[PDB]
Amino acid sequence: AARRIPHFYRVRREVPRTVNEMKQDFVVTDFYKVGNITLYTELHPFFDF
Amino acid sequence: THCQENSETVALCTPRIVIGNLPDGLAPGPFHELRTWEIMEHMRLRPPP
Amino acid sequence: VVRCVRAQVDLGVEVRAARCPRTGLWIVRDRRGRLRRWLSQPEVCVLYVTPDLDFYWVLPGGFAVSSRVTLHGLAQRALRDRFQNFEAVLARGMHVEAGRQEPETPRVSGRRLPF
Amino acid sequence: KRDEKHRHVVNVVLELPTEISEATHPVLATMLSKYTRMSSLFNDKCAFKLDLLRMVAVSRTRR
Amino acid sequence: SLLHTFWRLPVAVFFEPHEENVLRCPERVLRRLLEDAAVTM
Amino acid sequence: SLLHTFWRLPVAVFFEPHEENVLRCPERVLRRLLEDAAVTMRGGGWREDVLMDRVRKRYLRQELRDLGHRVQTYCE
Amino acid sequence: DYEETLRLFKTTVTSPNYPELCYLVDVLVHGNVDAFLLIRTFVARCIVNMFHTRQLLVFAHSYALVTLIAEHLADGALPPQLLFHYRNLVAVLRLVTRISALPGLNNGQLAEEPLSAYVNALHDHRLWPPFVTHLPRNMEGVQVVADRQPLNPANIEARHHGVSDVPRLGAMDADEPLFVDDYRATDDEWTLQKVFYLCLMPAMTNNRACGLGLNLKTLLVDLFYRPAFLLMPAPEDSIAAQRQAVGEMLTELVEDVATDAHTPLLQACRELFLAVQFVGEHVKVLEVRAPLDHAQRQGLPDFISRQHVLYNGCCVVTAPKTLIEYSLPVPFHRFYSNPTICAALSDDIKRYVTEFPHYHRHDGGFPLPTAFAHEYHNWLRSPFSRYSATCPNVLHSVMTLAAMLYKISPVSLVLQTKAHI
């Protein structure tokens, strides 16, 4: 696969965004609002879920 | 507005596409300046290079 | 479940199966109860195998290669000792009565005291 | 005999222009002595090429 | 290539999610997918 | 009297599935292509042989290394 | 006052006209010290000439290049401001590893680990720099994965130099045998390499750098096969005759970057040809499967931790124009994955960017391949790449990355507590 990484971009389909990338986009104050979706993932300060 | 067809005066509606299309009486220049400085804060460029 | 656009196959799929009341065709569902919806996706393909060892191979559109799995070309004892479901002996934590509700496993702890 | 495999590992395998003879190149003789001791890897001749290139590099050092 | 359907006249659908979804990807998506199947071999 | 859009139900006409609405052959050409892809598997890989090659090259590599350890400590 | 050296670093890393041979000399030397001593005056003339024609300071992409320059080239024969600049870069390294450590309370050790490797991840040997040139000293829990089994038998790691090892040169694409130059990295230079490749580089480039490698087995064989290299003594009548003698490719590579008024071109390419005896191997993507320390193992003890590093590769800041037929991009981390460079190198990635223009984001939102998609198992999560694309180019914005690498262990809580942090 170290050689074959052009074969991954041979396809024309995008990647789904992960939850941790879906958490970084929220600004500091509305993160506690119901407009956030990934609050049910956030459970512990020491462990991502 | 009222567009002028061939010996005709008709009404004409057209979308203002961007935020600068508002008149300065409703949204002035220094408001745009301060908005850009707010955006420059938001991308951590409030001291510009 | 073989997914060609991502080149990822699937090996263990548990699925519930039933028949429609109106027609004799099959309906597949999740083991929770959710309807399995991969059959609409055209790029994917699926292979179903039954507890009485029948065989389906469904490309999208519900059309199915249908057969039985052949195993007469394999020896009995090799298949019997290579993999086999296991019947348990009685140890600490299980009931002497069969089919009773099991209590908690012994679970020796690296977190608590041994006691 | 020996000459056909030496002209292989000089001209056919190594793709050397022939005017670099033996007498212009002694470490070439020290390398063809061990190049002929193996029989595989004559498809990836560029490995042999850069092997003799690093050999003429390491021989042409003042240290 | 084209299938032989038992029911002659076609039928609409209410498109329930509890109904199995019906092959909604059009022909340009199938063109993209044949390109993906050609390039992944 | 104005052209406002409203939420209509998603209507798309299809064919209800039956026990004999059969999918036809792929115009006899990919039928033949799948026949060639079927019959070419009589000569080729076997997918259980490769593990035997893995353990064989592993045993060959370690055994020649033990032979080198033997012969290097054979000339004291 | 390390500000102007960091300004020069920012203007030499974000510059689009970086000279091309800095990457090839980086993969050529592999940070091997006597290899650097052989090529010493060549790179001295190179950095002096290239700095005088253009205010960028070259070789700044590699940690190994700048540290060998500052340790061995420091005798003289250069204008002293450049040596001061390199000494300020290593002093910046020293300052941020003083910040990352706890100099107040680092007495003794625990479970045969020093306490400073428990509080911040810049000192643990489990975390690796993305651009590894030599194996470290400490591989206790570490599993190095080139293929299906990890390379725990230590006998598949050997490489000799200057002996004409012909089978390893034919096995430069063989993934299973590993070839290292038996200079095991100690702990402090492991910390400095982790600083340079984890922290300083993306903080200066705003995560616009990339990582690539060369197909040097088929690159040098049409780069040194001209008989001016082979029939060297142990010409120079005109520069055009040297140009046709050296071949077309070496002309625009080494035109003005190393040819001062005292040396000709063919002399300089002979001196760079001296260093080919340490050729190394192709680029590999290794996977580190080390678990955590014993403190953080107390929660989720079966948490393996995968971390993809590069071997024999080069951190790059631009697309090398004349090496696109012999190079290949490896976006393998949320740092060093610039979609512009990977678009410029390979064609299908450029096709993927032109069909999905929203993947031009430099903040780690670029899709990594499937063998790098363990972002929950990575040591450096998406907050880091989210932060680094918009951080300023300031020394405190450098040291803030080492600040965010403070570990969450109970002993790190004790240590940050007793220092009132």
Place this chain on the structure above:
Amino acid sequence: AHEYHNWLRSPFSRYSATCPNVLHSVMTLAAMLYKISPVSLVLQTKAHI
């Protein structure tokens, strides 16, 4: 002369006359091109612009 149907309206040209020659004043022309789509109206305020 069809100015309503034109993409860039009049007051961009009216602001650019007395616009000072500073780099931040250039960015005012950039951020005056924020579209007024409903998708822009949720994308702008999500970063509290």
Place this chain on the structure above:
Amino acid sequence: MFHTRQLLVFAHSYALVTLIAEHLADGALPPQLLFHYRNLVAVLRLVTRISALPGLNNGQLAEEPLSAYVNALHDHRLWPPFVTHLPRNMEGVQVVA
């Protein structure tokens, strides 16, 4: 014209200043002059950084990306008044003569 006058030339074309900042950047210029064109393209990159919202625009609702809806400086329908080459994608665009 930077020595006997005090104005840099070819500052009225993007298509000029990119080729100046890239292909005249390989040599044959005092780097004081080159850093002005480098600062020009850095200014342009800095101000197209402020146009989109790089912390938010990761998605595709249509063939257009997310960033082409927030600002007009990121969609293919908006054209500069001076062109040398046609754009890559002209879906909603039609040129007329």
Place this chain on the structure above:
Amino acid sequence: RARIAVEYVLIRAVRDEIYAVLRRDGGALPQRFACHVSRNMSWRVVWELCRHALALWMD
């Protein structure tokens, strides 16, 4: 080798069972699963995807 090979040759038996039954019917497989279809859709590409899919399952 046989003790490893048992399930793999069972998989091979399944694969040429598929091959024999697609040679048996002539290649016109019927429907057994309840999902609606569309006539105005090219089935050649989903047939090619089926071939590629059974290939990838054998790999």
Place this chain on the structure above:
Amino acid sequence: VDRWIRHAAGVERPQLLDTETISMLTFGSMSERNAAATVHGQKAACELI
């Protein structure tokens, strides 16, 4: 775009029928579900841009 905006605004898809549509014209419905618990009583806040 209706699938994206409603998800971005946190609004579910409209669920209705033909006999439900005519009954919205005459009377309407209690389409908004009551909250699970309200300590502040009922709520009302309108909008005017």
